[PDB]
Coordinates of N, CA and C and ligand atoms in Angstrom, one line a residue:
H5 N 24.7 12.4 -13.0 CA 23.4 12.6 -12.2 C 22.4 13.1 -13.0
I6 N 21.6 14.0 -12.4 CA 20.5 14.4 -13.3 C 20.7 15.3 -14.2
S7 N 20.1 14.8 -15.4 CA 20.3 15.7 -16.8 C 19.5 16.9 -16.7
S8 N 20.0 17.8 -17.7 CA 19.7 19.0 -17.9 C 18.2 19.2 -18.5
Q9 N 17.4 17.9 -19.2 CA 16.5 17.8 -19.4 C 15.6 17.8 -18.3
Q10 N 15.8 16.9 -17.4 CA 15.0 16.8 -16.1 C 15.0 18.2 -15.4
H11 N 16.2 18.8 -15.3 CA 16.1 20.3 -14.5 C 15.2 21.0 -15.3
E12 N 15.4 21.4 -16.5 CA 14.4 22.1 -17.3 C 12.9 21.7 -17.1
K13 N 12.7 20.4 -17.2 CA 11.3 20.1 -17.1 C 10.7 20.6 -15.6
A14 N 11.5 20.2 -14.5 CA 11.1 20.4 -13.2 C 10.9 21.8 -13.0
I15 N 11.6 22.6 -13.3 CA 11.6 24.3 -13.3 C 10.3 24.6 -14.2
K16 N 10.2 24.1 -15.2 CA 9.2 24.3 -16.0 C 7.8 24.2 -15.5
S17 N 7.7 23.1 -15.0 CA 6.5 22.4 -14.3 C 6.2 23.3 -13.0
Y18 N 7.2 24.1 -12.5 CA 7.0 25.0 -11.1 C 6.2 26.1 -11.5
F19 N 6.3 26.4 -13.0 CA 5.7 27.8 -13.4 C 4.2 27.2 -14.0
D20 N 4.3 25.9 -14.6 CA 2.9 25.4 -14.8 C 1.8 25.0 -13.8
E21 N 2.6 24.7 -12.7 CA 1.7 24.5 -11.6 C 1.2 25.8 -11.2
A22 N 1.6 26.8 -11.0 CA 1.2 28.2 -10.7 C 0.2 28.5 -11.9
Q23 N -0.1 27.9 -12.7 CA -0.6 28.2 -13.7 C -0.7 29.8 -14.2
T24 N 0.9 30.1 -14.5 CA 1.0 31.4 -15.0 C 2.3 31.2 -15.8
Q25 N 2.8 32.2 -16.5 CA 3.9 32.2 -17.5 C 5.0 33.1 -16.7
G26 N 6.4 32.4 -16.8 CA 7.5 32.8 -16.4 C 8.8 32.3 -16.7
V27 N 10.0 33.1 -15.8 CA 11.0 32.4 -16.4 C 12.2 32.9 -15.0
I28 N 13.2 32.4 -14.9 CA 14.1 32.4 -13.9 C 15.2 32.2 -14.4
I29 N 16.2 33.4 -14.3 CA 17.5 33.4 -14.9 C 18.6 33.3 -13.5
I30 N 19.6 32.3 -13.9 CA 20.6 32.1 -12.9 C 21.9 32.5 -13.7
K31 N 22.6 33.0 -12.8 CA 24.1 33.4 -13.4 C 24.9 32.6 -12.5
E32 N 26.2 32.2 -13.3 CA 27.1 31.5 -12.5 C 28.4 31.9 -13.2
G33 N 29.4 32.8 -12.5 CA 30.2 33.4 -13.1 C 29.8 34.5 -14.3
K34 N 30.1 34.0 -15.4 CA 29.7 35.0 -16.4 C 28.6 34.4 -17.2
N35 N 28.4 33.1 -17.1 CA 27.4 32.3 -17.6 C 25.9 32.4 -17.3
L36 N 25.1 32.7 -18.1 CA 23.4 32.9 -17.9 C 22.8 31.7 -18.2
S37 N 21.8 31.2 -17.4 CA 21.1 30.0 -17.6 C 19.5 30.4 -17.6
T38 N 18.8 30.1 -18.5 CA 17.5 30.4 -18.5 C 16.4 29.3 -18.2
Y39 N 15.6 29.3 -17.4 CA 14.7 28.2 -16.9 C 13.3 28.8 -16.8
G40 N 12.2 27.9 -16.8 CA 10.8 28.2 -16.8 C 10.1 27.9 -17.7
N41 N 8.8 28.4 -17.9 CA 7.8 27.9 -19.0 C 7.4 28.7 -20.0
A42 N 8.4 30.1 -20.0 CA 8.2 31.1 -21.1 C 9.6 31.9 -21.3
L43 N 10.4 31.0 -21.6 CA 11.9 31.5 -22.0 C 12.0 32.6 -22.7
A44 N 11.3 33.1 -23.6 CA 11.2 34.3 -24.4 C 11.3 35.6 -23.5
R45 N 10.5 35.5 -22.3 CA 10.4 36.6 -21.5 C 11.9 37.0 -20.8
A46 N 12.7 36.3 -21.0 CA 14.2 36.5 -20.6 C 14.6 37.9 -21.2
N47 N 14.2 38.3 -22.5 CA 14.8 39.5 -23.0 C 13.8 40.4 -23.3
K48 N 12.6 40.4 -22.6 CA 11.7 41.4 -22.7 C 11.5 42.4 -21.5
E49 N 11.0 43.7 -21.7 CA 11.1 44.7 -20.7 C 9.9 44.7 -20.0
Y50 N 10.0 44.8 -18.7 CA 8.8 45.1 -17.9 C 9.4 45.8 -16.7
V51 N 8.0 46.8 -16.0 CA 8.3 47.6 -15.1 C 9.0 47.0 -14.0
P52 N 10.1 47.8 -13.4 CA 10.8 46.8 -12.3 C 10.0 46.9 -11.2
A53 N 8.9 47.7 -10.9 CA 8.3 47.6 -9.6 C 9.1 47.7 -8.3
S54 N 8.7 47.1 -7.4 CA 9.4 47.1 -6.1 C 11.0 46.7 -6.2
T55 N 11.4 46.2 -7.2 CA 13.0 45.9 -7.4 C 13.7 46.9 -7.4
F56 N 13.0 48.2 -8.0 CA 13.6 49.5 -8.3 C 14.2 50.1 -6.7
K57 N 13.6 49.6 -5.8 CA 13.9 50.1 -4.5 C 15.3 49.9 -4.2
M58 N 15.9 48.9 -4.6 CA 17.4 48.6 -4.2 C 18.0 49.7 -5.0
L59 N 17.8 50.3 -6.3 CA 18.8 51.3 -6.8 C 18.2 52.6 -6.1
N60 N 16.8 52.6 -5.6 CA 16.3 53.9 -5.2 C 17.4 54.3 -3.7
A61 N 17.3 53.3 -3.2 CA 18.3 53.2 -1.7 C 19.6 53.6 -2.0
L62 N 20.2 52.9 -3.3 CA 21.6 53.1 -3.4 C 21.7 54.7 -3.6
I63 N 21.0 55.2 -4.5 CA 21.1 56.6 -4.8 C 20.5 57.5 -3.8
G64 N 19.4 57.3 -3.0 CA 19.4 58.0 -1.9 C 20.6 58.2 -0.9
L65 N 21.0 57.1 -0.5 CA 22.1 57.0 0.5 C 23.3 57.8 -0.2
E66 N 23.7 57.3 -1.2 CA 25.0 57.9 -2.0 C 25.0 59.6 -2.2
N67 N 23.5 59.9 -2.4 CA 23.6 61.2 -2.5 C 23.1 62.2 -1.5
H68 N 23.4 61.5 0.0 CA 22.8 62.1 1.1 C 21.4 62.4 1.3
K69 N 20.7 61.8 0.6 CA 19.1 62.4 0.8 C 18.5 61.4 2.0
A70 N 19.1 60.4 2.8 CA 19.0 59.8 3.8 C 20.1 59.0 4.3
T71 N 19.9 58.4 5.8 CA 21.0 57.6 6.1 C 20.0 56.3 6.6
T72 N 21.0 55.2 6.8 CA 20.3 53.9 7.1 C 19.7 54.1 8.4
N73 N 20.2 55.1 9.2 CA 19.3 55.2 10.6 C 18.1 56.0 10.7
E74 N 17.9 56.8 9.6 CA 16.9 57.7 9.6 C 15.5 57.0 9.8
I75 N 14.8 57.6 10.4 CA 13.2 57.1 10.5 C 12.3 57.8 9.6
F76 N 11.5 57.3 8.6 CA 10.6 58.0 7.7 C 9.4 57.9 8.5
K77 N 9.0 58.9 9.2 CA 7.6 58.9 9.9 C 6.4 58.8 8.8
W78 N 5.4 58.0 9.5 CA 4.2 57.8 8.5 C 3.5 59.1 8.9
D79 N 2.7 59.9 7.8 CA 2.2 61.3 8.2 C 0.8 61.2 8.6
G80 N 0.2 60.0 8.9 CA -1.0 59.8 9.5 C -2.1 59.5 8.3
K81 N -1.7 59.4 7.3 CA -2.8 59.4 6.1 C -2.9 57.9 5.6
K82 N -4.0 57.5 5.3 CA -4.4 56.2 5.1 C -3.3 55.6 3.8
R83 N -2.9 54.4 4.1 CA -2.0 53.9 3.2 C -2.6 52.5 2.8
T84 N -2.1 52.0 1.5 CA -2.7 50.8 0.9 C -2.8 49.9 2.1
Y85 N -1.7 49.6 2.9 CA -1.8 48.6 3.9 C -1.4 49.0 5.4
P86 N -2.1 48.3 6.6 CA -2.0 49.0 7.7 C -0.7 48.8 8.0
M87 N 0.0 47.7 7.6 CA 1.7 47.6 7.9 C 2.6 48.7 7.4
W88 N 2.0 49.3 6.5 CA 2.9 50.6 6.0 C 2.5 51.9 6.8
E89 N 1.5 52.0 7.8 CA 1.1 53.0 8.5 C 2.1 53.0 9.9
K90 N 3.2 53.1 9.5 CA 3.9 53.2 10.6 C 5.4 53.7 10.3
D91 N 6.2 54.3 11.4 CA 7.5 54.8 11.2 C 8.5 54.1 11.1
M92 N 9.4 54.0 9.8 CA 10.5 53.0 9.5 C 11.6 53.6 8.9
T93 N 12.8 52.8 8.8 CA 14.1 53.1 8.2 C 13.7 52.7 6.9
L94 N 14.8 52.7 6.1 CA 15.0 52.6 4.7 C 14.9 51.1 4.8
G95 N 15.7 50.4 5.3 CA 15.8 49.0 5.5 C 14.4 48.3 5.7
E96 N 13.7 49.1 6.5 CA 12.4 48.4 7.2 C 11.4 48.7 6.1
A97 N 11.6 49.7 5.2 CA 10.5 50.0 4.2 C 11.1 48.9 3.0
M98 N 12.2 48.5 3.0 CA 12.7 47.6 2.0 C 11.8 46.0 2.2
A99 N 12.1 45.6 3.4 CA 11.6 44.3 3.8 C 10.0 44.3 3.7
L100 N 9.4 45.6 3.6 CA 7.8 45.6 3.9 C 7.3 46.4 2.4
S101 N 8.4 46.4 1.5 CA 8.1 47.2 0.2 C 7.2 48.2 0.4
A102 N 7.7 49.4 1.6 CA 6.8 50.5 1.8 C 7.1 51.5 0.7
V103 N 6.3 51.2 -0.4 CA 6.6 52.3 -1.6 C 6.3 53.6 -1.3
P104 N 5.7 54.2 -0.2 CA 5.3 55.4 0.4 C 6.4 56.1 1.0
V105 N 7.6 55.0 1.6 CA 8.6 55.7 2.0 C 9.5 56.1 1.0
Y106 N 9.6 54.8 -0.1 CA 10.6 55.2 -1.3 C 10.3 56.2 -2.2
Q107 N 8.8 56.7 -2.4 CA 8.3 57.8 -3.2 C 8.6 58.9 -2.6
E108 N 8.8 59.0 -1.1 CA 9.4 60.2 -0.4 C 10.7 60.4 -0.8
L109 N 11.6 59.2 -0.7 CA 13.1 59.3 -1.0 C 13.4 59.8 -2.4
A110 N 12.5 59.1 -3.4 CA 12.5 59.7 -4.9 C 12.3 61.2 -5.0
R111 N 11.3 61.5 -4.1 CA 10.9 62.9 -4.3 C 12.1 63.7 -3.7
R112 N 13.0 63.3 -2.5 CA 13.8 64.2 -1.8 C 15.3 64.0 -3.1
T113 N 15.4 63.0 -3.4 CA 16.5 62.9 -4.5 C 15.9 64.1 -5.9
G114 N 14.6 64.2 -6.2 CA 14.6 64.9 -7.4 C 14.9 64.2 -8.8
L115 N 13.8 64.7 -9.5 CA 13.8 64.3 -11.0 C 14.9 64.1 -11.7
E116 N 15.6 65.5 -12.0 CA 17.0 65.7 -12.5 C 18.0 64.7 -12.0
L117 N 18.4 64.8 -10.6 CA 19.5 63.9 -10.1 C 18.8 62.3 -10.4
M118 N 17.7 62.2 -10.3 CA 17.3 60.7 -10.5 C 17.5 60.1 -11.9
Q119 N 17.2 61.1 -12.9 CA 17.3 60.9 -14.3 C 18.8 60.6 -14.6
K120 N 19.5 61.6 -13.8 CA 21.1 61.3 -14.1 C 21.8 60.1 -13.3
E121 N 21.1 59.9 -12.3 CA 21.8 58.9 -11.6 C 21.4 57.3 -12.2
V122 N 20.0 57.2 -12.8 CA 19.8 56.1 -13.3 C 20.3 55.8 -14.5
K123 N 20.7 56.8 -15.0 CA 21.2 56.9 -16.5 C 22.7 56.3 -16.3
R124 N 23.4 56.9 -15.3 CA 24.7 56.7 -14.6 C 24.9 55.2 -14.7
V125 N 24.1 54.6 -13.8 CA 24.1 53.1 -13.6 C 23.6 52.2 -14.6
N126 N 23.0 52.9 -15.7 CA 22.5 51.8 -16.8 C 21.6 50.9 -16.4
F127 N 20.4 51.5 -15.7 CA 19.5 50.5 -15.4 C 18.2 50.6 -16.3
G128 N 18.1 49.2 -16.7 CA 17.2 49.0 -17.7 C 17.2 49.7 -19.1
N129 N 16.2 50.4 -19.5 CA 16.1 51.3 -20.5 C 16.4 52.7 -19.9
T130 N 16.5 52.7 -18.6 CA 17.2 54.2 -18.2 C 16.1 55.3 -18.2
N131 N 15.2 55.0 -18.5 CA 14.1 56.2 -18.9 C 13.1 56.3 -17.8
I132 N 13.1 57.3 -17.0 CA 12.2 57.6 -16.0 C 11.3 58.7 -16.2
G133 N 11.0 59.0 -17.3 CA 9.9 60.2 -17.7 C 10.1 61.6 -17.0
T134 N 8.7 61.8 -16.5 CA 8.6 63.2 -15.8 C 8.0 63.2 -14.4
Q135 N 7.5 62.0 -14.2 CA 7.1 61.8 -12.7 C 8.1 60.9 -12.1
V136 N 8.9 61.7 -11.3 CA 9.9 61.3 -10.2 C 9.3 60.0 -9.1
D137 N 8.1 60.2 -9.0 CA 7.5 59.4 -7.8 C 6.7 57.9 -8.4
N138 N 6.6 57.6 -9.6 CA 6.0 56.6 -9.9 C 6.7 56.0 -11.2
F139 N 7.5 56.3 -12.1 CA 8.2 55.9 -12.8 C 8.6 54.3 -13.1
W140 N 8.8 53.7 -11.8 CA 9.1 52.7 -11.7 C 7.9 51.5 -11.4
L141 N 6.7 51.9 -11.2 CA 5.6 51.1 -11.0 C 4.6 51.1 -12.4
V142 N 4.7 52.1 -13.2 CA 3.8 52.3 -14.2 C 4.4 52.7 -15.6
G143 N 5.8 52.7 -15.5 CA 6.6 53.2 -16.7 C 6.6 54.6 -16.6
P144 N 7.6 55.1 -17.4 CA 8.5 54.7 -18.6 C 9.4 53.8 -18.4
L145 N 10.0 53.6 -17.2 CA 11.1 52.8 -16.8 C 10.6 51.3 -16.9
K146 N 11.6 50.7 -17.5 CA 11.6 49.1 -17.9 C 12.6 48.6 -17.7
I147 N 12.9 47.3 -17.4 CA 14.0 46.4 -17.6 C 13.8 44.8 -17.8
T148 N 14.5 44.2 -18.5 CA 14.4 42.7 -18.6 C 14.8 41.6 -17.4
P149 N 14.3 40.7 -17.4 CA 15.2 39.7 -16.4 C 16.5 39.5 -16.5
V150 N 17.3 39.6 -17.8 CA 18.7 39.3 -17.7 C 19.2 40.5 -17.4
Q151 N 18.6 41.7 -17.4 CA 19.3 42.9 -16.9 C 19.2 43.0 -15.3
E152 N 18.0 42.3 -14.8 CA 17.7 42.2 -13.4 C 18.8 41.5 -12.8
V153 N 19.1 40.1 -13.3 CA 20.4 39.1 -12.7 C 21.8 40.1 -12.7
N154 N 21.9 40.7 -14.0 CA 23.1 41.3 -14.1 C 23.5 42.4 -13.0
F155 N 22.4 43.1 -12.7 CA 22.1 44.2 -11.7 C 22.5 43.5 -10.3
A156 N 21.7 42.2 -10.3 CA 22.0 41.6 -8.8 C 23.2 41.1 -8.8
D157 N 23.7 40.6 -10.0 CA 25.1 40.3 -9.7 C 26.3 41.2 -9.4
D158 N 25.9 42.5 -10.2 CA 26.9 43.7 -9.9 C 26.7 43.9 -8.4
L159 N 25.7 44.0 -7.7 CA 25.6 44.6 -6.6 C 26.0 43.5 -5.5
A160 N 25.7 42.3 -5.9 CA 26.4 41.3 -4.8 C 28.0 41.2 -5.0
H161 N 28.5 41.6 -6.1 CA 30.1 41.7 -6.1 C 30.3 43.2 -5.7
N162 N 29.7 44.0 -5.5 CA 30.0 45.4 -5.2 C 30.5 46.2 -6.6
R163 N 30.3 45.9 -7.7 CA 30.6 46.5 -8.8 C 29.9 47.5 -9.3
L164 N 28.6 47.9 -8.6 CA 28.0 48.9 -9.1 C 28.8 50.3 -8.7
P165 N 28.4 51.4 -9.4 CA 29.1 52.5 -9.1 C 28.8 53.3 -8.1
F166 N 29.1 52.8 -6.8 CA 28.5 53.6 -5.7 C 29.8 53.1 -4.5
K167 N 29.8 53.9 -3.5 CA 30.8 53.5 -2.4 C 30.7 52.1 -2.1
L168 N 31.6 51.4 -1.7 CA 31.6 50.1 -1.2 C 30.7 49.9 -0.1
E169 N 30.7 51.1 0.7 CA 29.8 51.0 2.2 C 28.5 51.2 1.6
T170 N 28.4 51.9 0.7 CA 26.6 52.1 0.4 C 26.2 50.9 -0.2
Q171 N 26.8 50.0 -0.9 CA 26.4 48.9 -1.5 C 26.1 47.8 -0.4
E172 N 26.9 47.9 0.3 CA 27.2 46.9 1.7 C 25.5 47.3 2.6
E173 N 25.5 48.7 2.7 CA 24.2 49.1 3.7 C 23.2 48.6 3.0
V174 N 22.9 48.6 1.6 CA 21.7 48.2 1.0 C 21.7 46.8 1.0
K175 N 22.8 46.0 0.8 CA 22.6 44.4 0.7 C 22.2 44.0 2.0
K176 N 22.7 44.6 3.3 CA 22.1 44.3 4.5 C 20.5 44.1 4.5
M177 N 20.0 45.3 3.7 CA 18.7 45.3 3.8 C 17.8 44.2 2.9
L178 N 18.4 43.4 2.1 CA 17.9 42.3 1.2 C 18.1 41.1 1.7
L179 N 18.6 40.8 3.1 CA 18.7 39.4 3.6 C 17.3 39.0 3.9
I180 N 16.5 37.8 3.3 CA 15.5 37.5 3.4 C 15.1 35.9 3.7
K181 N 16.4 35.4 3.7 CA 16.4 34.0 4.3 C 17.8 33.2 4.3
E182 N 17.9 32.2 4.8 CA 19.3 31.3 5.3 C 18.6 30.0 5.3
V183 N 19.2 29.2 4.4 CA 18.9 28.0 4.0 C 20.1 26.9 4.3
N184 N 20.1 25.9 4.9 CA 21.2 24.9 4.9 C 22.7 25.6 4.7
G185 N 23.0 26.6 5.5 CA 24.3 27.4 5.4 C 24.2 28.4 4.3
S186 N 23.5 28.5 3.6 CA 23.3 29.4 2.3 C 22.2 30.5 2.8
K187 N 22.8 32.0 2.3 CA 22.1 33.0 2.6 C 21.4 33.4 1.3
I188 N 20.2 34.0 1.4 CA 19.4 34.5 0.2 C 19.2 36.0 0.3
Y189 N 19.7 36.7 -0.4 CA 19.4 38.2 -0.6 C 18.3 38.2 -1.9
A190 N 17.4 39.3 -1.8 CA 16.6 39.5 -2.8 C 15.4 40.5 -2.7
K191 N 14.8 41.1 -3.5 CA 13.6 42.0 -3.6 C 12.5 41.5 -4.1
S192 N 11.5 41.3 -3.5 CA 10.4 41.0 -4.5 C 9.9 42.3 -5.2
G193 N 8.9 41.9 -6.1 CA 8.2 43.1 -6.8 C 7.0 42.8 -7.4
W194 N 6.0 43.4 -7.4 CA 4.6 43.2 -8.2 C 4.1 44.4 -8.7
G195 N 4.1 44.4 -10.2 CA 3.4 45.5 -10.6 C 2.1 45.4 -11.0
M196 N 1.3 46.0 -10.1 CA -0.2 45.8 -10.2 C -0.7 47.0 -11.1
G197 N -0.1 48.0 -11.0 CA -0.5 49.2 -12.0 C -0.3 49.2 -13.5
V198 N -0.1 47.8 -14.0 CA 0.1 47.7 -15.3 C -0.6 46.3 -15.7
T199 N -0.7 46.4 -16.8 CA -1.4 45.3 -17.6 C -0.6 44.6 -18.9
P200 N -0.3 43.5 -18.7 CA -0.6 42.4 -17.6 C 0.2 42.7 -16.5
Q201 N -0.1 42.1 -15.3 CA 0.7 42.4 -14.2 C 2.1 41.6 -13.9
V202 N 2.9 42.4 -13.8 CA 4.5 41.6 -13.4 C 4.9 41.4 -12.0
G203 N 5.5 40.1 -12.0 CA 6.1 39.8 -10.7 C 7.4 39.4 -10.8
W204 N 8.5 39.7 -9.7 CA 9.7 39.6 -9.6 C 10.1 39.2 -8.3
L205 N 11.2 38.7 -8.4 CA 12.1 38.0 -7.2 C 13.4 38.0 -7.5
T206 N 14.3 39.0 -7.4 CA 15.7 39.3 -7.9 C 16.6 39.3 -6.6
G207 N 17.6 38.4 -6.6 CA 18.4 38.4 -5.5 C 19.8 37.5 -6.0
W208 N 20.5 37.0 -4.9 CA 21.4 35.9 -4.9 C 21.5 35.4 -3.8
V209 N 22.2 34.1 -4.2 CA 22.3 33.4 -2.7 C 23.9 33.3 -2.6
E210 N 24.3 33.5 -1.3 CA 25.6 33.4 -0.7 C 25.8 32.1 -0.1
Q211 N 26.6 31.2 -0.8 CA 27.0 30.0 -0.5 C 28.0 30.0 0.9
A212 N 27.9 28.8 1.5 CA 29.0 28.9 2.7 C 30.4 29.1 2.2
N213 N 30.6 28.2 1.0 CA 32.3 28.7 0.3 C 32.3 30.1 0.0
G214 N 31.1 31.0 0.3 CA 31.3 32.3 -0.2 C 31.2 32.8 -1.8
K215 N 30.9 31.7 -2.4 CA 30.3 31.9 -3.7 C 28.9 32.6 -4.0
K216 N 28.9 33.7 -4.8 CA 27.5 34.4 -4.8 C 26.7 33.9 -6.2
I217 N 25.7 33.4 -6.2 CA 24.9 32.8 -7.4 C 23.6 34.0 -7.5
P218 N 23.6 34.9 -8.5 CA 22.5 35.7 -8.6 C 21.4 35.1 -9.4
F219 N 20.2 35.7 -9.4 CA 19.3 35.0 -10.1 C 18.1 36.2 -10.0
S220 N 17.2 36.0 -10.9 CA 16.1 36.9 -11.2 C 15.0 36.0 -11.6
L221 N 14.0 36.0 -10.9 CA 12.6 35.3 -11.2 C 11.6 36.2 -11.8
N222 N 10.9 36.2 -13.1 CA 10.1 37.0 -13.5 C 8.7 36.3 -14.0
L223 N 7.5 36.7 -13.7 CA 6.4 36.0 -13.9 C 5.2 37.1 -14.2
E224 N 4.2 36.3 -14.8 CA 2.9 37.2 -14.8 C 1.9 36.9 -13.7
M225 N 1.7 37.9 -12.9 CA 0.8 37.9 -12.0 C -0.3 38.0 -12.2
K226 N -1.4 37.0 -11.8 CA -2.8 36.9 -12.1 C -3.4 36.9 -10.6
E227 N -4.6 38.0 -10.5 CA -5.6 38.0 -9.4 C -6.0 36.9 -8.9
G228 N -5.8 36.7 -7.6 CA -6.4 35.4 -7.0 C -5.1 34.4 -6.6
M229 N -3.9 35.2 -7.4 CA -2.5 34.5 -6.8 C -1.9 35.1 -5.9
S230 N -1.3 34.3 -5.0 CA -0.5 34.5 -3.8 C 1.1 35.3 -4.3
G231 N 1.6 36.2 -3.5 CA 2.8 36.8 -3.6 C 3.9 35.7 -3.4
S232 N 3.4 34.7 -2.5 CA 4.3 33.8 -2.0 C 4.7 32.7 -3.2
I233 N 4.0 32.9 -4.1 CA 4.4 31.7 -5.2 C 5.8 32.1 -5.7
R234 N 5.8 33.3 -5.9 CA 7.3 33.9 -6.4 C 8.3 33.0 -5.9
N235 N 8.1 33.3 -4.4 CA 9.0 32.7 -3.5 C 9.2 31.0 -3.4
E236 N 8.0 30.5 -3.5 CA 8.1 29.2 -3.5 C 8.8 28.6 -5.0
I237 N 8.0 29.2 -5.9 CA 8.9 28.8 -7.3 C 10.3 29.1 -7.3
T238 N 11.0 30.3 -6.7 CA 12.2 30.4 -7.1 C 13.0 29.5 -6.0
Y239 N 12.5 29.4 -4.8 CA 13.2 28.4 -3.9 C 13.5 26.9 -4.3
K240 N 12.3 26.5 -5.0 CA 12.0 25.1 -5.5 C 13.0 25.1 -6.8
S241 N 13.1 26.0 -7.5 CA 13.9 26.0 -8.9 C 15.5 26.2 -8.1
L242 N 15.8 27.0 -7.3 CA 17.1 27.0 -6.6 C 17.7 25.7 -6.1
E243 N 16.6 25.0 -5.5 CA 16.8 23.7 -4.7 C 17.1 22.6 -5.8
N244 N 16.2 22.6 -6.8 CA 16.2 21.5 -7.8 C 17.6 21.5 -8.6
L245 N 18.4 22.8 -8.7 CA 19.5 23.1 -9.3 C 20.7 22.9 -8.5
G246 N 20.3 22.4 -7.3 CA 21.4 22.5 -6.2 C 22.2 23.7 -5.8
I247 N 21.6 24.6 -5.9 CA 22.0 26.2 -5.4 C 21.9 26.3 -4.0
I248 N 20.8 25.8 -3.4 CA 20.6 25.8 -2.0 C 20.3 24.5 -1.4
Ligands
MXC28 C1 3.7 42.0 -3.3 C2 4.6 43.0 -2.8 C3 5.2 42.6 -1.2 O1 4.2 42.4 -0.6 C4 4.6 41.9 0.7 N1 5.7 41.5 1.0 O2 4.0 42.1 1.8 C5 3.9 44.5 -2.6 N2 3.9 45.1 -3.8 C6 4.0 46.6 -4.4 C7 5.3 47.3 -4.9 C8 6.7 46.7 -5.0 O3 6.5 45.7 -6.2 C9 4.8 48.7 -4.9 C10 3.4 48.8 -4.8 C11 2.9 50.0 -4.9 C12 1.3 49.8 -4.4 C13 0.2 51.1 -4.4 N3 -1.0 50.8 -4.1 O4 0.7 52.2 -4.9 C14 0.8 48.4 -3.9 C15 1.6 47.4 -3.7 N4 3.0 47.6 -4.3 C16 2.7 44.5 -1.9 O5 1.6 44.7 -2.8 O6 2.4 43.7 -0.7 S1 6.2 43.1 -3.9 O7 6.7 41.8 -3.7 O8 7.4 44.2 -3.5

């Protein structure tokens, strides 16, 4: 059927079209496949930005800093977006990328317990520095695309070091799409507080047959660029490969 050359060329063109530089790592079993127009990005470290919420939620829930039904009330102070000026659960904050909610969860957890938990799960370079409420947005915490797909892979298969129920609670927060019998779980991310700006879309597809195929899209976000491009490129790549 389709040659590997054609698949690589098609996915590369998806990034070229967006006029940006990026990569998308696909994992099948133990095998990693790297596609895109800037393959060397696969092993380079970038702030995780919003993708860190996945782990933030895992930690908070596990260490009883919150429950999946707890409503984090908006304090009435102006937020970056109107959509964030409301009361929401962790899951809702997850789908809305409600950073203010996760900064509160981070503060509840505390620096010491956070550094110890990040270290314990071995996330990225595992360094969160001294500011417990922004280490995943402007550093020092960093992680590579390869590490992100492995994290997605682990969560998808419940291999992370947390109660089975905790991982399941968080996975439920990540369902972002259903395509032709396939379910797509993922967390987007956009580090605007760093230069250059990094974009993420890390998750996995759950196929009808039950097989889970993890992936991590990582690229450079440029102003005047839509966050939906990450989603378009990811879906087109997944589809081109016949994943969905
Ligand atoms: C593009 C997304 C999601 O956007 C949707 N889905 O609406 C999101 N980005 C993000 C993230 C997570 O990366 C973290 C912040 C922090 C700020 C701040 N001012 O302190 C501003 C935007 N922040 C956004 O700005 O809207 S990202 O894919 O999570």
